[PDB]
Design a protein around this ligand. Structure first.
Ligand SMILES: *[C@@H]1O[C@H](CO[C@@H]2O[C@@H](C)[C@@H](O)[C@@H](O)[C@@H]2O)[C@@H](O[C@@H]2O[C@H](CO)[C@@H](O[C@@H]3O[C@H](CO[C@H]4O[C@H](CO)[C@@H](O)[C@H](O)[C@@H]4O[C@@H]4O[C@H](CO)[C@@H](O)[C@H](O)[C@H]4NC(C)=O)[C@@H](O)[C@H](O[C@H]4O[C@H](CO)[C@@H](O)[C@H](O)[C@@H]4O[C@@H]4O[C@H](CO)[C@@H](O)[C@H](O)[C@H]4NC(C)=O)[C@@H]3O)[C@H](O)[C@H]2NC(C)=O)[C@H](O)[C@H]1NC(C)=O
Ligand SMILES: *[C@@H]1O[C@H](CO[C@@H]2O[C@@H](C)[C@@H](O)[C@@H](O)[C@@H]2O)[C@@H](O[C@@H]2O[C@H](CO)[C@@H](O[C@@H]3O[C@H](CO[C@H]4O[C@H](CO)[C@@H](O)[C@H](O)[C@@H]4O[C@@H]4O[C@H](CO)[C@@H](O)[C@H](O)[C@H]4NC(C)=O)[C@@H](O)[C@H](O[C@H]4O[C@H](CO)[C@@H](O)[C@H](O)[C@@H]4O[C@@H]4O[C@H](CO)[C@@H](O)[C@H](O)[C@H]4NC(C)=O)[C@@H]3O)[C@H](O)[C@H]2NC(C)=O)[C@H](O)[C@H]1NC(C)=O
Ligand SMILES: [Cl-]
Lengths: 207, 13, 207, 15
């Protein structure tokens, strides 16, 4: 029988008012011969009927991937409302139900620290500009970099690591040409998280 | 007071 | 049928002369109506016959876990010698064969930088001593802290991350009581990797 | 001679 994966909305989507978050319910292994899928969406046991079905994609491995997406309210998802997808199909004995929701647990606001490149690193072409983000919960976060107005794309950010106080932390590393750093350019670390004032904050970091 | 990011509004309180 | 998982030895074991490294071969899902398991081993095609077998153990889920272990030579491993473990079982249409080796690719030497805790983090009861280990290959690595010859266990290391230039990097967060740090007590970040002079390097920091 | 150690345990010696 088919399988069903329930995905949370994208963090920048729940966190920014300008963006529209959505819970995505995905049903794979849908048979070439009973591809009819019925959906029943619920919000805390309460049923809701405003969901949309994305067009059928044939996977070329003999099965269909059937997806139904449901918009969620920024305020409903942060408060912690549980979302439960229910998939039925002639090829599937009892209907299948799955449920997601904002990680449970008191949200903890992140402290953000920007650590300059160590003296020993100034021999290489490019230096490493570090951002420490620690002590947050949930782990769902967004972090990017920019320099006077303009975004700096050359960086890699670690997956959130479970710290020992129950919260999460991470590091973002921005690499810039040593010169840029040597000549007083200012670099800002933008962090976007549920438990921040206005779910946002930037930190400075120049020489 | 409000917050922004590359333009786009983030949030207010 | 039964399945086969072939694991590398531990980095610390291949990086320390004083330790003995071994490749493990684990067979799970071994059936009672045929627990007999043959094992054949090949270092670079060349068969070898010194692979002890570890206590057979019951999983309580219906199946046996049969494990054979093969001591390797620090030298052989680091150089990149493919190990083949071959597993036969009456309840099995044809031998399974798994092979593992030192990640292919030009060993790069990891650069190590102790980043000090942010000016703006001394109003908390605990500051964050950071260790950056960039630009290393393969991602197999060890990393611990210590002070006055004494180990520091209150830290957390990120997993290794793939960088822009086809190498890996990682950060290790050591958490210490503000006071201690302020005292001046000196803390050292020990990094252990196949590409270091002597595999070992120890960047420290204080004030 | 030219060796690395780690908490008493010998690591290696290239030399
Ligand atoms: C026939 O083909 C289909 C179609 O797939 C495709 O087939 C061919 C043509 C190639 O194109 C394939 O590579 C291609 O995928 C096959 O469908 C695949 O089926 C597998 C499982 O059978 C599904 O795996 C699940 O994947 C999700 C993650 O998937 C995201 O990422 C995928 C790549 O990383 C991407 O391909 C997916 O589309 C998906 O994308 C996300 O989508 C949302 C909304 O659309 C979007 O917002 C996201 O941004 C987007 N993410 C992206 C794009 O990266 C994964 O989460 C599942 O993992 C769980 O379950 C496993 C056990 O089932 C467990 O081992 C895993 O570790 C993981 O378990 C969980 O761990 C978390 C924390 O880590 C924990 O909280 C959970 O509780 C825990 N749950 C457990 C253990 O159950 C899962 O593996 C593929 O998505 C799916 N492919 C597609 C395209 O959907 C089909 O199987 C084929 N049939 C055959 C061959 O017979
Ligand atoms: C009966 O019981 C046993 C054990 O039961 C266990 O305990 C009970 C109480 C329950 O709670 C169970 O839920 C639990 O499983 C069952 O045996 C299990 O069988 C599964 C699969 O059938 C095996 O999964 C594999 O796990 C390995 C990694 O396993 C390590 O990590 C586990 C913790 O996450 C740990 O339990 C293991 O002991 C093992 O630990 C490591 O051991 C080494 C050496 O001993 C040690 O040095 C390490 O430090 C240690 N690490 C630790 C502790 O963290 C995982 O690698 C496998 O994933 C690969 O294979 C999948 C196919 O199954 C594939 O889908 C994945 O993508 C992945 O594939 C590989 O990826 C790599 C790199 O990407 C690469 O080689 C290839 O691309 C690819 N190779 C492939 C595909 O071949 C795999 O998921 C469990 O290990 C095993 N558990 C134990 C304890 O042995 C048994 O099935 C039960 N039978 C039933 C229920 O019917
Ligand atoms: Cl399922």
């Amino acid at each position: 029988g088919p399988s069903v994966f329930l995905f949370p909305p994208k963090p920048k989507d729940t966190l920014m008012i300008s963006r529209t978050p959505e819970v995505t319910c995905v049903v794979v292994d849908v048979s070439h011969e009973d591809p009819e899928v019925k959906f029943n969406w619920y919000v805390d046991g309460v049923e809701v009927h405003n969901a949309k079905t994305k067009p059928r994609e044939e996977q070329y491995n003999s099965t269909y991937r059937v997806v139904s997406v449901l918009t969620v309210l920024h305020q409903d998802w942060l408060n912690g409302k549980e979302y439960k997808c229910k998939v039925s199909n002639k090829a599937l004995p009892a209907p299948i139900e799955k449920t997601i929701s904002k990680a449970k647990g008191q949200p903890r606001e992140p402290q953000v620290y920007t650590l300059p490149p160590s003296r020993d690193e100034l021999t290489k072409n490019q230096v490493s500009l570090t951002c420490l983000v620690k002590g947050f919960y949930p782990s769902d976060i967004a972090v990017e970099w920019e320099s006077n107005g303009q975004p700096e794309n050359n960086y890699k950010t670690t997956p959130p690591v479970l710290d020992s106080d129950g919260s999460f932390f991470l590091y973002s590393k921005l690499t810039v040409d040593k010169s840029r750093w040597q000549q007083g350019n200012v670099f800002s670390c933008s962090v976007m998280h549920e438990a921040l004032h206005n779910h946002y904050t930037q930190k400075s970091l120049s020489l | 007071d409000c917050a922004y990011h590359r333009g786009e509004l983030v949030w207010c309180t």
